Design a protein around this ligand. Structure first.
Ligand code: SF4
Ligand SMILES: [Ca+2]
Length: 588
């Protein structure tokens, strides 16, 4: 039901896909779906599809949910949480008012949704979703409805994972396409993220600021009596103080694992009631949400209720999840409790109901991906092989890690070794750190003109640095997991510390899960993901068979990763060996 392929990185990954997935494609009616995580990857796919469009016929359109593609809803209202359901009701009512006679109701709903001009743009130019949104904006035509209008005559579709893996959304999506999950083919772009996408989509949380929000909604819409003497506002106060007492009492320096029944226990003891009562009041809150939703709708607002969406998430929290999820409490962002999905096999399972094709270029040992993802498929290493002498991977002793976030002494060795390498190699380097504290500690010990990448991010200032990166000079600092992971220019990578997952309660839980299941919690929850994080930087450094680069790791326990990286070396003088490597590269 699936195939996993590995291509050496860059400009090819998605061309190879249709070149390895014209198999089936259209001889058995099938539709080609392209799932993508970030919008940055989306366009790296679409740019490829655009190139091959002149080769032979392909009719593609990007597809995304109203949550992204509805223009109106951000002007009419602006909520801090939202969902596809509420936007459905909202929009359907607007379309009613337009079709009834009030075109102003929603000025983006008109003939242009079905016009040749619009459909020409979608197929002949094949924009990204962000690009087709902009088109729609300037042309006063709804992007979403346009996509859905163009969909039934589309052979190929490029959508986010979070769109399709939303069960209720996928059903409407396919009901309009005409295709069924039998008649589909799904290409999983950068499928090395599949495990993480599952755990992400699967998880949910109830945060204090979310209760705060429902509290204001409660006051807005009557704050009626749920029980005789307990109002909506009172119930919310009960639920927030359960959470706050839990965060106060249960956790210190950060996250903590708790048991799901604990919240209800805290709920029961504090307020002197049993489950029946608390379950009921929680239900009566969801019902109030339903009232709020109806009341917002009949006015013309987006019918989204914080009390409705909170009610369900608490019910969901307290009810299921004991085996495949973990109950994490957290002090962050006022506090929240979370259902951390530890095993994404059950979320991703819906995919093997269609034919899947797992594209990456970075999932070295497949067993881990198969065991984690729960995908029992063949694995082929389809990719014309780049020579190993064109690459240089090595790890270094000096900066010996007895602790993972301590020792000023061994942090000086981190600064010096870096400074020796960059000043001597003199090439376009980016130094990934495992955290912001180590990067900030190193930067003030270091004394060379570099380029920061601190929290805040914002899309505009990311390019301002990227402009000066490609053009002149060289060095850039970044935290590994950050947004420099989304991209000639590059040449050397200095992993200033091996990018392990943080001492989370979640990562602790994941270890336990893959300890109780395979007796290898370390290999499954720490190493394999870290190896795949590394390989990715190595992969984004060398994309061509004629491109060159180096990648050092400053870590004493980096030796582990030889069986994941079969051409890694070890160094005691990395500065000189990398320089000696680059002299050998220049030669040719
Ligand atoms: S037609 Fe209007 S209400 Fe519907 S998704 Fe488009 S902008 Fe939103
Ligand atoms: Ca509802």
């Amino acid at each position: 039901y699936g195939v996993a392929l590995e291509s050496p990185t860059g400009s090819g990954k998605t061309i190879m896909a249709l070149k390895s997935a014209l198999q089936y494609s259209s001889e058995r009616k099938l539709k080609v779906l392209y799932l993508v995580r970030t919008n940055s990857q989306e366009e790296q796919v679409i740019k490829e599809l655009r190139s091959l469009s002149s080769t032979m016929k392909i009719r593609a359109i990007p597809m995304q949910g109203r949550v992204n593609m509805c223009i109106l809803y951000r002007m009419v209202d602006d909520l801090h949480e939202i969902n596809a359901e509420s936007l459905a009701k909202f929009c359907n009512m607007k379309k009613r008012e337009v079709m009834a006679g009030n075109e102003a109701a929603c000025p983006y709903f008109n003939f242009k949704i079905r016009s040749d001009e619009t459909k020409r743009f979608l197929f002949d130019e094949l924009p990204t979703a962000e690009e087709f949104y902009d088109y729609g904006e300037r042309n006063n035509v709804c992007p979403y409805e346009s996509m859905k209008a163009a969909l039934p005559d589309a052979d190929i579709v490029i959508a986010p994972y979070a769109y399709f893996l939303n069960r209720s959304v996928a059903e409407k999506f396919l009901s309009h396409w005409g295709v069924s999950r039998n008649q589909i083919v799904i290409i999983l772009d950068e499928a090395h993220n599949l495990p993480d996408i599952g755990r992400s989509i699967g998880s949910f949380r109830i945060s204090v600021e979310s209760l705060n929000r429902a509290d204001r909604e409660a006051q807005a819409y009557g704050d009626p009596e749920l029980s005789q003497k307990i109002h909506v506002s009172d119930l919310i106060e009960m639920i927030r103080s359960a959470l706050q007492s839990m965060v106060s009492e249960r956790c210190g320096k950060g996250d903590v694992r708790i048991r799901f029944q604990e919240f209800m226990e805290y709920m029961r003891i504090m307020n002197k009631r049993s489950e029946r009562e608390i379950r009921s009041l929680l239900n009566y809150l969801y019902l109030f949400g339903e009232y709020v939703e109806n009341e917002k709708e009949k006015v013309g607002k987006v019918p989204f209720s914080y009390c409705s969406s909170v009610a369900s998430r608490i019910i969901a929290f307290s009810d299921q999840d004991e085996e495949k999820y973990a109950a994490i409490l957290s002090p962050e962002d006022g506090g929240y409790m979370q259902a951390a999905c530890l095993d994404p096999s059950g979320i991703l399972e819906v995919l093997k109901e269609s034919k899947t094709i797992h594209m990456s270029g970075t999932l070295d040992p497949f067993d881990f991906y198969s065991d984690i993802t729960g995908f029992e498929i063949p694995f082929k290493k389809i990719g014309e092989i780049f020579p190993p002498e064109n690459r240089y991977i090595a790890y270094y002793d000096g900066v010996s890690s007895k602790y993972d976030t301590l020792d000023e002494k061994e942090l000086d060795r981190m600064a010096t070794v870096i400074e020796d390498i960059i000043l001597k190699v003199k090439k376009n380097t980016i130094v990934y750190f495992p955290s912001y504290s180590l990067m900030d500690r190193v930067e003030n010990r270091v004394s060379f003109e570099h380029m920061k990448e601190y929290r805040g991010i914002d899309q505009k200032e990311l390019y301002s640095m990227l402009k000066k990166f490609r053009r002149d000079h060289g060095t850039i600092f970044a935290v590994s997991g950050g947004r420099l992971s989304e991209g000639n220019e590059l040449e050397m990578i200095i992993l200033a510390g091996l990018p392990f997952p943080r001492p989370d309660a979640i990562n602790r839980s994941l270890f336990d899960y893959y300890e109780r299941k395979y007796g290898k919690g370390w290999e499954y929850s720490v190493v394999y993901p870290t190896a795949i994080k590394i390989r990715q930087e190595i992969g984004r450094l060398i994309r061509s068979a004629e491109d060159t680069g180096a990648c050092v790791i400053l870590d004493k326990r980096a030796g582990q990763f030889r069986k994941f990286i079969p051409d890694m070396k070890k160094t005691s003088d990395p500065a000189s060996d990398i320089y000696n490597f680059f002299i050998s590269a220049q030669a040719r």
